[PDB]
Amino acid sequence: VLMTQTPLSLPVSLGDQASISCRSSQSTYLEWYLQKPGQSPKLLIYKVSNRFSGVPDRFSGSGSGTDFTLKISRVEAEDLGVYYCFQGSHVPLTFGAGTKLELKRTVAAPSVFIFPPSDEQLKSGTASVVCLLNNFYPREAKVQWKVDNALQSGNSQESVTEQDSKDSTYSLSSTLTLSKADYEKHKVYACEVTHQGLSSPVTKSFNR
Amino acid sequence: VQLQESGPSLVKPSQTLSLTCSVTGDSITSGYWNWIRKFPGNKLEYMGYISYSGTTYYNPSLKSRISITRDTSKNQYYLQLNSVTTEDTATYYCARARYGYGFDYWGQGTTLTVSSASTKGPSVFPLAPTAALGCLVKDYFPEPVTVSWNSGALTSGVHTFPAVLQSSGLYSLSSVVTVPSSSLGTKTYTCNVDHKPSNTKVDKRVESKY
Numbered sequence: 001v002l003m004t005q006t007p008l009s010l011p012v013s014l015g016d017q018a019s020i021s022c023r024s025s026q027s028t029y030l031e032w033y034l035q036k037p038g039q040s041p042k043l044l045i046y047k048v049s050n051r052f053s054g055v056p057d058r059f060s061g062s063g064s065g066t067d068f069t070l071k072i073s074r075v076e077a078e079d080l081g082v083y084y085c086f087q088g089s090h091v092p093l094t095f096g097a098g099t100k101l102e103l104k105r106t107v108a109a110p111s112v113f114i115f116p117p118s119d120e121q122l123k124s125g126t127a128s129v130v131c132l133l134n135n136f137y138p139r140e141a142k143v144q145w146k147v148d149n150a151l152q153s154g155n156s157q158e159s160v161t162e163q164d165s166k167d168s169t170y171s172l173s174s175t176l177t178l179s180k181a182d183y184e185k186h187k188v189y190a191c192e193v194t195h196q197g198l199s200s201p202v203t204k205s206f207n208r
Numbered sequence: 209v210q211l212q213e214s215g216p217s218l219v220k221p222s223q224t225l226s227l228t229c230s231v232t233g234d235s236i237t238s239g240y241w242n243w244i245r246k247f248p249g250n251k252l253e254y255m256g257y258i259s260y261s262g263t264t265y266y267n268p269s270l271k272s273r274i275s276i277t278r279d280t281s282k283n284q285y286y287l288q289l290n291s292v293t294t295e296d297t298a299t300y301y302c303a304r305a306r307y308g309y310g311f312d313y314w315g316q317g318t319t320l321t322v323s324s325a326s327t328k329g330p331s332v333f334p335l336a337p338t339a340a341l342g343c344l345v346k347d348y349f350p351e352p353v354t355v356s357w358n359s360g361a362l363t364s365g366v367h368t369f370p371a372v373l374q375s376s377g378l379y380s381l382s383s384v385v386t387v388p389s390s391s392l393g394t395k396t397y398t399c400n401v402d403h404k405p406s407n408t409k410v411d412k413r414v415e416s417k418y
């Protein structure tokens with residue numbers, strides 16, 4: 001009934017083996033699907049271990065009781081996308097959460113930039129402050145807004161690009177939204193960034 | 209075998225969602241005919257089916273609000289989802305299942321947004337401090353907006369971010385470009401924003417101190 005996939009993000013190098021685990025919460029119609037960017041999900045494996053038509057032999061499914069595994073033996077770029085296990089033996093029919101296969105590269109620290117609200121925006125009673133984290137790896141990054149050294153929360157939103165096809169990096173924007181009244185209440189605006197490529201956290205800031 | 213979803217791209221909170229799957233190359237009086245949705249974040253939810261005989265199955269999570277019907281004379285089947293919230297925002301897929309195998313043929317999917325907001329064009333604000341510049345494309349509805357730089361002459365170093373749905377119910381995104389810091393004092397940078405749904409087109413010079 002519950003289907004647990006591990007991991008949810010799976011880095012791999014092209015030509016290496018990738019393995020995706022799927023555990024069912026009880027005890028055979030177990031399938032694997034792939035959704036590549038810009039297309040619908042596609043059936044890879046049926047009845048635990050059987051390859052569907054048109055599916056390359058580098059894809060194989062296996063599994064004991066409750067433990068199921070999809071192996072991709074020599075990953076190609078066309079294999080990048082989101083993989084899902086699925087059980088259709090018992091109602092309700094359930095998918096696992098999905099494992100995104102992405103490309104390994106060396107750790108790359110973000111270049112961090114802060115952008116104050118424009119004068120054009122301030123005249124309409126809203127203030128948006130934007131922190132850019134540029135061209136980093138891995139995807140995992142923490143951004144913290146500080147306003148006069150007071151840690152902010154609930155009032156920022158993050159957006160992240162898909163992995164870059166040329167350099168395998170990510171980029172991330174974080175936007176702190178305030179009213180113009182609350183923007184003018186404080187002076188120092190800073191975003192503090194924590195990431196594997198930074199030996200300690202980087203802070204970028206300005207004065208209103 | 210081809211499946212194709214149709215229906216509105218948008219509905220308001222509490223209203224009914226009603227979608228259609230048109231099937232060709234096969235008869236819906238054979239096999240299993242399913243509805244599946246993908247949330248933002250790439251979680252998939254199996255919703256239910258109507259079978260070859262007309263018998264249905266519904267996921268208990270949706271059982272109160274869901275109805276799957278068909279018209280064999282048109283080779284169509286239908287999804288009705290009552291009382292929608294902002295958490296029914298998803299891509300909706302119809303899919304055939306072949307007994308013993310799985311979901312072998314899928315439609316292209318249809319993006320549904322749940323929102324009480326009306327069509328509104330964006331405000332375009334400059335982001336100014338290798339150096340970075342950008343534009344904050346703010347408070348628009350619906351998606352999409354397209355952004356380009358220097359009339360599409362500048363593509364390298366550009367990152368246009370996925371839109372985020374704000375607590376107000378309007379979209380916002382940022383588009384940024386990284387450039388040589390030496391070129392800041394000698395060159396100019398304009399973002400070109402297009403919002404076809406509201407007929408809005410805006411060009412914004414991103415000027416800086418240098």
Ligand SMILES: C[C@]12CC[C@H](O)C[C@@]1(O)CC[C@@H]1[C@@H]2CC[C@]2(C)[C@@H](c3ccc(=O)oc3)C[C@H]3O[C@]132
Nearest residue numbers: 029088089090091240265305306307308309310
């Ligand atoms: C076609 C199918 C699709 C999903 C998987 O690929 C397995 C499957 O191919 C075969 C199995 C099939 C499944 C769809 C759901 C089922 C019809 C379900 C069921 C529901 C009501 C009932 O009265 O009896 C059984 C439980 C299991 O028999 C199911």
